[PDB]
PDB file of all heavy atoms in Angstrom:
ATOM      1  N   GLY Q  16     108.976 119.695  91.919  1.00 33.61           N
ATOM      2  CA  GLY Q  16     108.671 118.370  92.093  1.00 33.61           C
ATOM      3  C   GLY Q  16     107.417 117.639  91.456  1.00 33.61           C
ATOM      4  O   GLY Q  16     107.121 116.518  91.733  1.00 33.61           O
ATOM      5  N   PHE Q  17     106.723 118.489  90.636  1.00 31.79           N
ATOM      6  CA  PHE Q  17     105.625 117.894  89.737  1.00 31.79           C
ATOM      7  C   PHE Q  17     106.052 116.733  89.143  1.00 31.79           C
ATOM      8  O   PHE Q  17     107.013 116.767  88.315  1.00 31.79           O
ATOM      9  CB  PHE Q  17     105.198 119.036  88.794  1.00 31.79           C
ATOM     10  CG  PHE Q  17     103.907 118.576  87.988  1.00 31.79           C
ATOM     11  CD1 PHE Q  17     102.737 118.679  88.669  1.00 31.79           C
ATOM     12  CD2 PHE Q  17     104.012 118.209  86.637  1.00 31.79           C
ATOM     13  CE1 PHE Q  17     101.584 118.348  87.931  1.00 31.79           C
ATOM     14  CE2 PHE Q  17     102.894 118.071  85.899  1.00 31.79           C
ATOM     15  CZ  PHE Q  17     101.635 117.979  86.606  1.00 31.79           C
ATOM     16  N   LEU Q  18     105.389 115.599  89.332  1.00 32.66           N
ATOM     17  CA  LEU Q  18     105.804 114.225  88.766  1.00 32.66           C
ATOM     18  C   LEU Q  18     105.343 114.122  87.366  1.00 32.66           C
ATOM     19  O   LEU Q  18     104.266 114.424  86.960  1.00 32.66           O
ATOM     20  CB  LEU Q  18     105.135 113.007  89.587  1.00 32.66           C
ATOM     21  CG  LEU Q  18     105.975 112.292  90.526  1.00 32.66           C
ATOM     22  CD1 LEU Q  18     105.477 112.537  91.952  1.00 32.66           C
ATOM     23  CD2 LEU Q  18     105.924 110.887  90.318  1.00 32.66           C
ATOM     24  N   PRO Q 366      94.522 117.306  96.415  1.00 36.58           N
ATOM     25  CA  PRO Q 366      95.753 117.113  95.603  1.00 36.58           C
ATOM     26  C   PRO Q 366      95.403 116.101  94.479  1.00 36.58           C
ATOM     27  O   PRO Q 366      94.690 115.147  94.728  1.00 36.58           O
ATOM     28  CB  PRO Q 366      96.760 116.499  96.513  1.00 36.58           C
ATOM     29  CG  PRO Q 366      96.083 115.969  97.616  1.00 36.58           C
ATOM     30  CD  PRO Q 366      94.761 116.818  97.719  1.00 36.58           C
ATOM     31  N   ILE Q 367      95.697 116.478  93.163  1.00 38.02           N
ATOM     32  CA  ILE Q 367      95.249 115.718  92.064  1.00 38.02           C
ATOM     33  C   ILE Q 367      96.337 115.056  91.252  1.00 38.02           C
ATOM     34  O   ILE Q 367      97.302 115.821  90.877  1.00 38.02           O
ATOM     35  CB  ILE Q 367      94.401 116.510  91.094  1.00 38.02           C
ATOM     36  CG1 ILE Q 367      93.161 117.027  91.887  1.00 38.02           C
ATOM     37  CG2 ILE Q 367      94.143 115.864  89.805  1.00 38.02           C
ATOM     38  CD1 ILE Q 367      92.302 117.971  91.131  1.00 38.02           C
ATOM     39  N   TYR Q 368      96.357 113.767  90.867  1.00 40.85           N
ATOM     40  CA  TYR Q 368      97.227 113.179  89.982  1.00 40.85           C
ATOM     41  C   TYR Q 368      96.510 112.775  88.655  1.00 40.85           C
ATOM     42  O   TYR Q 368      95.631 111.979  88.748  1.00 40.85           O
ATOM     43  CB  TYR Q 368      97.822 111.931  90.490  1.00 40.85           C
ATOM     44  CG  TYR Q 368      98.853 112.174  91.550  1.00 40.85           C
ATOM     45  CD1 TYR Q 368      98.591 112.093  92.867  1.00 40.85           C
ATOM     46  CD2 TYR Q 368     100.220 112.460  91.151  1.00 40.85           C
ATOM     47  CE1 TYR Q 368      99.522 112.346  93.916  1.00 40.85           C
ATOM     48  CE2 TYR Q 368     101.094 112.625  92.104  1.00 40.85           C
ATOM     49  CZ  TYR Q 368     100.869 112.586  93.468  1.00 40.85           C
ATOM     50  OH  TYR Q 368     101.880 112.756  94.356  1.00 40.85           O
ATOM     51  N   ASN Q 412      95.288 122.151  92.743  1.00 27.33           N
ATOM     52  CA  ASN Q 412      96.449 121.523  93.181  1.00 27.33           C
ATOM     53  C   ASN Q 412      96.743 120.170  92.437  1.00 27.33           C
ATOM     54  O   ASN Q 412      96.649 119.150  92.995  1.00 27.33           O
ATOM     55  CB  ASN Q 412      96.401 121.304  94.644  1.00 27.33           C
ATOM     56  CG  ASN Q 412      97.569 120.631  95.245  1.00 27.33           C
ATOM     57  OD1 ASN Q 412      98.478 120.417  94.582  1.00 27.33           O
ATOM     58  ND2 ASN Q 412      97.398 120.292  96.577  1.00 27.33           N
ATOM     59  N   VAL Q 413      97.183 120.333  91.110  1.00 30.68           N
ATOM     60  CA  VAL Q 413      97.654 119.112  90.390  1.00 30.68           C
ATOM     61  C   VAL Q 413      98.997 118.784  91.094  1.00 30.68           C
ATOM     62  O   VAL Q 413      99.655 119.581  91.669  1.00 30.68           O
ATOM     63  CB  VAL Q 413      97.879 119.457  88.917  1.00 30.68           C
ATOM     64  CG1 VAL Q 413      98.180 118.161  88.223  1.00 30.68           C
ATOM     65  CG2 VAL Q 413      96.725 119.970  88.216  1.00 30.68           C
ATOM     66  N   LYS Q 414      99.394 117.599  90.951  1.00 33.05           N
ATOM     67  CA  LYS Q 414     100.607 117.032  91.594  1.00 33.05           C
ATOM     68  C   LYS Q 414     101.652 116.169  90.813  1.00 33.05           C
ATOM     69  O   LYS Q 414     102.618 116.005  91.140  1.00 33.05           O
ATOM     70  CB  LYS Q 414     100.242 116.479  92.915  1.00 33.05           C
ATOM     71  CG  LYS Q 414      99.982 117.495  94.013  1.00 33.05           C
ATOM     72  CD  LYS Q 414     100.420 117.126  95.418  1.00 33.05           C
ATOM     73  CE  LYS Q 414     101.222 118.082  96.116  1.00 33.05           C
ATOM     74  NZ  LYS Q 414     100.450 119.339  96.381  1.00 33.05           N
ATOM     75  N   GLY Q 415     101.035 115.620  89.703  1.00 33.12           N
ATOM     76  CA  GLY Q 415     101.829 114.731  88.723  1.00 33.12           C
ATOM     77  C   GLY Q 415     100.916 114.600  87.566  1.00 33.12           C
ATOM     78  O   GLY Q 415      99.809 115.037  87.546  1.00 33.12           O
TER      79      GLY Q 415
END
Side-chain angles (χ1 to χ4, degrees):
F17 186 74
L18 263 112
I367 295 177
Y368 285 97
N412 178 6
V413 189
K414 282 212 130 66

